[PDB]
Design a protein around this ligand. Sequence first.
Ligand SMILES: [Ca+2]
Ligand SMILES: [Ca+2]
Ligand SMILES: [Zn+2]
Lengths: 346, 541
Amino acid sequence: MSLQMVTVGHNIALIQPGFSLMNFDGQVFFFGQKGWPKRSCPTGVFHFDIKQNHLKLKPAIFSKDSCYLPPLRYPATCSYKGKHQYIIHGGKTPNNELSDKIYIMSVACKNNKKVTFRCTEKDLVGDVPEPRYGHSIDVVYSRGKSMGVLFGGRSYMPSTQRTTEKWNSVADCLPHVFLIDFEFGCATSYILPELQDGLSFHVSIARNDTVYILGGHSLASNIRPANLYRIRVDLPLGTPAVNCTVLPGGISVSSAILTQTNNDEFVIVGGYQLENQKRMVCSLVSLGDNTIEISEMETPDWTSDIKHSKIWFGSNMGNGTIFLGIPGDNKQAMSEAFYFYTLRCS
Amino acid sequence: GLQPAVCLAIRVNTFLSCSQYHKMYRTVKAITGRQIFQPLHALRNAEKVLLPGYHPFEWQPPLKNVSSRTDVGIIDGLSGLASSVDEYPVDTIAKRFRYDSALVSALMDMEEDILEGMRSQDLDDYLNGPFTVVVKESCDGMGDVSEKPEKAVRFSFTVMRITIEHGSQNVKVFEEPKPNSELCCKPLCLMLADESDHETLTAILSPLIAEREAMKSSELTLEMGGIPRTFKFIFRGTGYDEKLVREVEGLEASGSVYICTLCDTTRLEASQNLVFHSITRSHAENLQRYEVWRSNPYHESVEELRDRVKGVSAKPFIETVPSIDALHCDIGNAAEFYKIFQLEIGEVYKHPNASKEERKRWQATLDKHLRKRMNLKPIMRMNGNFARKLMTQETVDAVCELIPSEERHEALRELMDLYLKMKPVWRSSCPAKECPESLCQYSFNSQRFAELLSTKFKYRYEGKITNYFHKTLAHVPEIIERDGSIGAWASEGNESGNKLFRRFRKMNARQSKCYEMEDVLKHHWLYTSKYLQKFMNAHNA
DNA sequence: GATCTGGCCTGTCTTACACAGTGATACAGC
DNA sequence: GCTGTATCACTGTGTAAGACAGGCCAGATC
Ligand SMILES: [Ca+2]
Ligand SMILES: [Ca+2]
Ligand SMILES: [Zn+2]
């Protein structure tokens, strides 16, 4: 319950809602700038550090071998901590295409705290999904082995119903589950019976053999249900197997923000209860080996603009630290583009 | 009594209200007994013929990804983009037609003109040949349009040349008399957004690009004067300033080391090799070169990668023709030699590294002196009137009388007559016939300018040079060989249309910020028809 | 303790951005 | 003498972002 107001560097303009914050080695990096990459910072990914509530988005460079990647605007990221690296997939490019590539994002070198990145375009082979955004992907383990489980968000209309008065219309993707191996990048889809509706902007937790999915919006029904889903996954040497279970007692919040404040104990912060009612409360989800549950924290205090703005956005910095953004009222003394806040929960 | 069409051309073409016209009508009808102006609802039913969305038409083949209906009106510009609190925030309002349904009314309003062209060019009026229609597209941000800022972009097109392939050759069935004027570029979409807010700009302009790529391999059959006729199209998007071609074709920003949107050169190299280039930047080469940026197949570092990809860093999404603007070229040249007048007041070839106070004095004495000689108005942003007025021999001979030394007199007079010798062959709308001899002398006419810059002006033009001067020297004898005309392929109409937006905005609106962008589009469509402009030459015909 | 580079800041240089439109008057035909 | 155009003298500032080059400087390095 520790709110703190932040000031900005010289270029606030590289912010946009739906960014991506990557935590490598305590260092924080920013990816998903507004617009195409400028000439002063050609990779469009930044050493994002903050000293005394003042942040310095310094540019980060790439390796000899990397493949420069476009700034996605709602991708799916996960933490392959097996060296330490991240996996980026999906999102929405600046030209509002939907990508469907795999981006392996790792540290190439770091000399005198000057980082050097390497990302590689891992391509998907086999039962690929459609390109989509608002989806989520977790890494998972079983029996000395590991996989990537991907649950869908929303996407465009298919290539036959694309009429140019609904050319930017969107629908929920199919409730499938996509199992991905990254040793060859092979993709296997799976139809699963307990999942019926398309879901978007949801929360995915990977407790090391089982992924729990809470929240998210169903667009085709235009509600945000309070259903969480526990998915058990296991791979033998032959064909792997999945399982779904419905555990009652969830919360009806779309696009919340997650971080890990304790081991086997995660924490979600304020999103959207309804289309007019944002989620003001904030929760500590106490996980478990088999049984998990969700409790409230002691309601962190906000300020006037946060209790006054219609929207917010942000992500986590990785080390128990939430970054939030606010539009700010335009009918004022030429007010700034966005205001910024940090939440700390100790 | 009157037609509904003549009084429609009245109420549009002199900007009366929805209610002042009722006053004029009721006073005329009360005084002179007989009604002379048609009433309101009888005017409104006569609007619907001239709007898009009235006539049957079909395509061969039926168009991929396009709805096949013929009864579309004004459609919402978001193309059904969801604007929900859960996803990305948008706040722009945009309105548009489709692209086929606009071209239908654009061809059917000039029906009498193409029929009379068929008469005057000695052909069958009962002909149904495969016409080719050349359409020029234009787009510009026209921002700071508020009232007691906010920006706005119109994307617009122009029917320019209708040509049949009769027998063994082609004939110009219809040609536009004044290409780059404000009343013959028709509004197609308009939005309230920044011209560099790249997300929302792409999100609105991508449907029209989809429809444009759709109708590049089909035919339109349309009942044109009794019998049906068939049209195929050729699009050239040309109406772009340097910023928009530099942006949406996906180059670096305008201050790049790589300058030309047509060839590939650097300013530390362009200042020595002046005229040996060509056009070496397509749209497809640009797209695949973005792809070879994104893959990095050789694994080289960033500074020589950008050497190899020649400064592409983005995915282009609008096919343009690589071609100069005519207006902004002249404005850039004008402001350049105005600044070189300001510099040559100081005579800084004698003493370099002058102070940043005496330059303001050089500006002040330039403005006061040229207000004394030729009465130029002291302004900052060079408009079109200032651009036309600065490039006279009288002003350069006046400041020649101001400057002390003798070699600067020849150095400025000879340069001014060389530049004015170069000017109209791009300034003209058909310079292939209007001044067709200096058009052939242009090579010597340009390289003399180049050599006297590199020799007698090498104090400044040994290192950096600016952008538009490279375009003037390097390209336009090849642009006349490719496309022919120059000034017809400009955005002067689109650049002039912006005042009409403001006048329509504060004289015809319903104050809802959603119908407000309907009715300005409807009125701007009703303006630029040639069916109504034919009535406003009745006192000339 | 010398001696280095990249970090930041100026600091110029490039493209865009509002002049068109109104009463009065004056000439050219008619 | 009448009318239809053609001038005519008025009006309004310096921004807004963004690329590229040196100058400096300041802690890192040998
Ligand atoms: Ca422009
Ligand atoms: Ca303009
Ligand atoms: Zn060139």
